[PDB]
Amino acid sequence: ATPVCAVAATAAAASAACGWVGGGIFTGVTVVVXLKHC
């Protein structure tokens, strides 16, 4: 695992954090709000 394991943990961690960032959070928040009330 060493370096390889660390890489997976990094990319794997982003799965959620990375997904939320990059405008992903706005998409869900913006999308949810609308459909939520829109």
Longest Cα separation, the chain: 49
Q: How many CB atoms lie within 10 A of CB 32?
A: 11
Relative orientation angle of helices 24-37 and 2-20, to the nearest 10 degrees? 40
What letter would DSSP give residue 21?
T
* Phi, psi angle pair for 21, to nearest 5°: -85, 165
Contacts of 24 (CB under 8 A, 6+ apart): 18
Per the structure, the complete domain to which residue 33 belongs is given by 2-37
Method of determination used here: NMR
Q: Alpha carbon of 23 to those of 12, 32, 33, 35: distances in Å?
A: 18, 14, 15, 18
Q: How many domains does the chain have?
A: 1
What burial letters (b/e) apply to 5-31, b meaning 16+ CB within 10 Å?
eeeeeeeeeeeeeeeeeeeeeeeeeee
